[PDB]
């Protein structure tokens, strides 16, 4: 199987209220394992998964150091962005950065990520070749030139193939029971009259992991999109995920509709019907 490790950094300036707030969260696949928040009462990297809580003091001291350094870099970048875009220090601004690696089944790097947005819009991203950057605007082109000048892509690649993969492997081993296990959804179909002539069929998938899932409706075996509603996959709050998909149907035609569910945890795809 393929796995991923990703970090998500968010920095938000707040003029008149001191330094920008920095938040970092780390994920292995769809499981959060660490958090750092500069507004925490005692800012430090904190465990959010049992399979990392066990790491010795070295790990927490070093992760805390790196999180703080990342926050510093983000503050510097916020200042720089004020320069690039000719913006006032009195306005609030946001930087978002995601980066990480995909470990392939063969054990080598499958894919790398390093991308950032400024005020909610693409700023700069590492291309598929892992060697070049896409700059979203003229401002980001300054950054592109700087990074070409200081071999940033190469050094990041060194991280991808180095510590990123090594730690991903390590976490996968230390928490195999929970990380390498795919929990299938518990599914069912409910029926909710809309009027005396129409009704809603809702197909539920609960308690599943990982988050990836497919949920569709068919009529007489044909794919249905008209009059359907699929909600965003949502967290259960316990490390699992949920989703439902509904379709409005003419009363009396319910038994021609089937819900189809695909998930890694299922031996076979599901074909479900309203079971009154």
């Amino acid at each position: 199987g393929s796995h991923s490790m990703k970090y998500f950094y968010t920095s938000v300036s707040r003029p008149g209220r001191g330094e920008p707030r920095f938040i970092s969260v780390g994920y292995v696949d769809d499981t959060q394992f660490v958090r750092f928040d500069s507004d925490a009462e005692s800012p430090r990297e904190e465990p959010r998964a049992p399979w990392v809580e066990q790491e010795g003091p070295e790990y927490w001291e070093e992760a805390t150091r790196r999180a703080k350094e990342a926050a510093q870099t983000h503050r510097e970048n916020l200042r720089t962005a004020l320069r690039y875009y000719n913006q006032s220090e009195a306005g609030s601004h946001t930087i978002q950065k995601m980066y990480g690696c995909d470990l392939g089944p063969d054990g080598r790097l499958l894919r790398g990520y390093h991308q950032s947005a400024y005020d909610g819009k693409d700023y700069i991203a590492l291309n598929g070749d892992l060697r070049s950057w896409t700059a979203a605007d003229m401002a980001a082109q300054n950054t592109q030139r700087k990074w070409e000048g200081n071999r940033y892509a190469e050094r990041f690649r060194a991280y991808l193939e180095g510590e990123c993969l090594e730690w991903l492997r390590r976490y996968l081993e230390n928490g195999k029971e929970t990380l390498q296990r795919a929990d299938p959804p518990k599914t069912h179909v409910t029926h909710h009259p809309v009027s005396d002539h129409e009704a809603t069929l809702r197909c539920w998938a609960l308690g599943f992991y990982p988050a990836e899932i497919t949920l569709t409706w068919q009529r007489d075996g044909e794919e249905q999109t008209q009059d359907t509603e699929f909600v965003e996959t949502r967290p259960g709050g316990d490390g699992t995920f949920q989703k439902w998909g509904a379709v409005v149907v003419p009363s009396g035609e319910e038994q021609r509709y089937t819900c189809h569910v695909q998930h890694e945890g299922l031996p076979e795809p599901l074909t479900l019907r309203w079971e009154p």
Partner: peptide, 10 residues
């Protein structure tokens, strides 16, 4: 650690 050591300044 897993945290990126290299710092990318804009």
């Amino acid at each position: 650690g897993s945290h990126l050591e290299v710092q990318g300044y804009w």
